[PDB]
Scaffold this motif. Structure first.
Motif, PDB file in Angstrom:
ATOM      1  N   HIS A   1      25.379 -23.470 -34.315  1.00 35.11           N
ATOM      2  CA  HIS A   1      25.690 -23.189 -35.824  1.00 35.11           C
ATOM      3  C   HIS A   1      26.132 -21.494 -35.924  1.00 35.11           C
ATOM      4  N   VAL A   2      25.754 -20.831 -34.939  1.00 35.04           N
ATOM      5  CA  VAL A   2      25.986 -19.390 -34.920  1.00 35.04           C
ATOM      6  C   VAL A   2      27.539 -19.074 -34.682  1.00 35.04           C
TER       7      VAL A   2
ATOM      8  N   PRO B   1      30.623 -19.618 -35.977  1.00 34.72           N
ATOM      9  CA  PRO B   1      31.405 -18.469 -36.832  1.00 34.72           C
ATOM     10  C   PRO B   1      30.767 -17.122 -36.791  1.00 34.72           C
ATOM     11  N   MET B   2      29.622 -16.951 -36.626  1.00 29.61           N
ATOM     12  CA  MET B   2      28.862 -15.542 -36.686  1.00 29.61           C
ATOM     13  C   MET B   2      29.137 -15.040 -34.937  1.00 29.61           C
TER      14      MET B   2
ATOM     15  N   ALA C   1      32.598 -13.686 -35.652  1.00 28.28           N
ATOM     16  CA  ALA C   1      32.820 -12.969 -36.379  1.00 28.28           C
ATOM     17  C   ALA C   1      32.782 -11.332 -36.339  1.00 28.28           C
ATOM     18  N   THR C   2      31.658 -11.209 -35.611  1.00 29.99           N
ATOM     19  CA  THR C   2      31.108  -9.812 -35.721  1.00 29.99           C
ATOM     20  C   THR C   2      30.587  -9.289 -34.440  1.00 29.99           C
TER      21      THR C   2
ATOM     22  N   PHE D   1      32.624  -5.152 -32.135  1.00 33.25           N
ATOM     23  CA  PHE D   1      31.610  -4.632 -33.044  1.00 33.25           C
ATOM     24  C   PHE D   1      30.173  -4.240 -32.265  1.00 33.25           C
ATOM     25  N   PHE D   2      29.541  -5.097 -31.658  1.00 31.22           N
ATOM     26  CA  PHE D   2      28.318  -5.075 -31.221  1.00 31.22           C
ATOM     27  C   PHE D   2      28.409  -4.147 -29.989  1.00 31.22           C
TER      28      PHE D   2
ATOM     29  N   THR E   1      25.139 -14.342 -26.400  1.00 30.42           N
ATOM     30  CA  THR E   1      25.190 -15.914 -26.443  1.00 30.42           C
ATOM     31  C   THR E   1      26.709 -16.320 -25.705  1.00 30.42           C
TER      32      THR E   1
END
Lengths: 104, 436
Positions: A1-2, A4-5, A8-9, A13-14, A38
């Motif tokens: 379920h992660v 989209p995240m 997304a970012t 970014f990280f 992941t």
């Protein structure tokens, strides 16, 4: 379920702030943060983080390592061990690290 | 019992007033006494403020409330015994103890106007004692009785859009519904009546504290201390009895519709108002306690505050993070709150779905993660001994317990950056935990 995240970012970014490993502790949990890449457990985040981990491992330039490089290599090997089915084309960097480590 | 005779003897010894005491003693001699004939002499004795008479009268009234039973009159006269700061310390202490004994007992549980008036009185002595020890004991008694009201409610349950738009969204109407004095009890619908009485008592206490908090330097001043104690009591109620607020069984009858409604929805407007007009203050302690309350809201009541959490984060907190001139203490406190949030996976995925997935709703999860990252980059300190001191300056996951404070009368940037980085690592750990 992660998922989209996942996209997304992470990709651009990280890696940006986790590239604080270039300045010194905090390095240990920064590397532990890089370990939590992941791989859809689509390939850009995995490629970026694995390339960064290989670069900070700095295997191809021996006699310049510190504890930071050893920790990075340990994290990369552990990630290869525990996520083999998901690195996909990224196995090349892990194998390069292994081969260069074999040169001691 | 044994104490009533001694107290009547004492008040007769202190003596117009005496004839009541001898009449009561004669009545007891024919044993058990009439409530009025014992209540009147004590009330007359406490009508005057002296050293030995008022104290023993108040003590006798409080101890007699513990048995038999008038109750409204006794509570009213006990409250009236406190004229103000002019009253000396011992009288105030005796008033506080008598109120505690009257509210708290195995039998005789006052409901409605009496309990609320007693709580308000105890708060009044706490605010205007002009004495440290009396203030401390008054606050202790006040927080103990406030906690035990919701403890009673918990036992009953166990045995059972912008910022300015939040001023007028009064979902639950409470037009003079409270202050029912005649209700009192000891030790199907018959049980539900007592349950509703207890719910109304809890709601009235919470509403009194909300009205205290909504009001409006000098941290020992009167209005600031009032706001601090109101906020801290609200936070204690949310923390120590969160199961009361979050339980759907807990319901309260409406006022203008007489329809049972969830307790959280009944106080949703009050809590939202208590955060909107009072959080993001220019004084550190108020902002800190407001952040505590908001974090409790965010971790335990997302479903019933889906829009209000969005409004708070966008207009109050994330805006505070974005401001360049915002105070650093507040920034660090809310970053600690964010770190506390990061460990919860559900509180992250539900925060993403309800807010970021929606197109109209402003981006929340992405912007808070970006704000953490921005803090996790800049670094003022260069001396490694500061890093060693900070690492030594370690006492974990956010777990909840009883919370209570007491208002009786190294670089912030580096620790803030370290907290942001640790919160990001916690976010990744929580995500990989949620992935499995």
């Amino acid at each position: 379920h992660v998922g989209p995240m996942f996209d997304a970012t992470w990709m651009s970014f990280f890696s940006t702030l986790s590239s604080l490993v270039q300045k010194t502790d905090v390095n240990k949990l920064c590397l532990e943060g890089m370990k939590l890449a992941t791989k859809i457990a689509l390939s850009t985040p995995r490629e970026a983080f694995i390339s960064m981990l290989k670069n900070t491992a700095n295997l191809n330039n021996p006699r310049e390592m510190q504890a930071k490089n050893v920790e990075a290599l340990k994290v990369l090997l552990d990630l290869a061990q525990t996520e083999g089915n998901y690195l996909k084309e990224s196995w090349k960097d892990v194998l390069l690290c292994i081969s260069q480590l074999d040169r001691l | 019992l044994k104490f009533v005779v001694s107290s009547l003897d004492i008040i007769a010894a202190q003596a117009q007033l005496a004839e009541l005491a001898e009449k009561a003693l004669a009545a007891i001699k024919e044993n058990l006494p009439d409530p009025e004939v014992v209540f009147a002499p004590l009330q007359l004795a406490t009508k005057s403020g002296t050293i030995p008479l008022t104290t023993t009268a108040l003590d006798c009234i409080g101890k007699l409330i513990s048995y038999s039973y008038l109750i409204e009159r006794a509570i009213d006269t006990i409250c009236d015994c406190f004229q103000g700061e002019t009253t000396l310390v011992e009288i105030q202490l005796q008033i506080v103890k008598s109120l505690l004994a009257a509210v708290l007992n195995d039998k005789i549980i006052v409901h409605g106007a009496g309990l609320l008036k007693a709580v308000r009185q105890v708060y009044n002595i706490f605010l205007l004692s002009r004495s440290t020890a009396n203030q401390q004991v008054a606050q202790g008694t006040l927080t103990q009785m406030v906690g035990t009201v919701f403890e009673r409610v918990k036992t009953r349950l166990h045995m059972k859009l912008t910022l300015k738009d939040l001023e007028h969204r009064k979902s639950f109407d409470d037009s003079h519904m409270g202050d029912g004095p005649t209700m009192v009890s000891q030790v199907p619908e018959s049980l539900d009546a007592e349950d509703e009485a207890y719910i109304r008592d809890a709601y009235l206490v919470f509403r009194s504290f909300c009205n205290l908090s909504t009001k409006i330097y000098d941290l020992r001043g009167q209005p600031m201390r009032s706001k601090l104690i109101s906020l801290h009591l609200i936070h204690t109620l949310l923390n120590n009895h969160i199961t009361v607020f979050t339980s759907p069984l807990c319901t309260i009858r409406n006022t203008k519709n007489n329809e049972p409604t969830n307790f959280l929805q009944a106080i949703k407007y009050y809590l939202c108002l208590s955060i909107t007009r009072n959080g993001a203050s220019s004084v550190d302690r108020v902002f800190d306690i407001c952040c505590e309350i908001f974090w409790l809201m965010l971790k335990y009541m997302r479903s019933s505050f889906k829009n209000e959490i969005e409004v708070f984060l966008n207009e109050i907190y994330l805006a505070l993070l974005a401001r360049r001139n915002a105070p650093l203490s507040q920034k660090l406190t809310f970053v600690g709150i964010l770190k506390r949030l990061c460990e919860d996976p559900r509180a992250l995925v539900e925060l993403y779905l309800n807010y970021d997935c929606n197109q109209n709703v402003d981006n929340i999860f992405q912007t808070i993660v970006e704000d953490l990252s921005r803090f996790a980059t800049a670094s003022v300190p260069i001396t490694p001994t500061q890093e060693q001191q900070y690492e030594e300056s370690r006492s974990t996951a956010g777990e909840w317990q009883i919370k209570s404070v007491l208002p009786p009368p190294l670089p912030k940037e580096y620790v803030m950056k370290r907290t942001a980085l640790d919160s990001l690592v916690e976010t990744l750990r929580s995500l990989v935990h949620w992935s499995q």
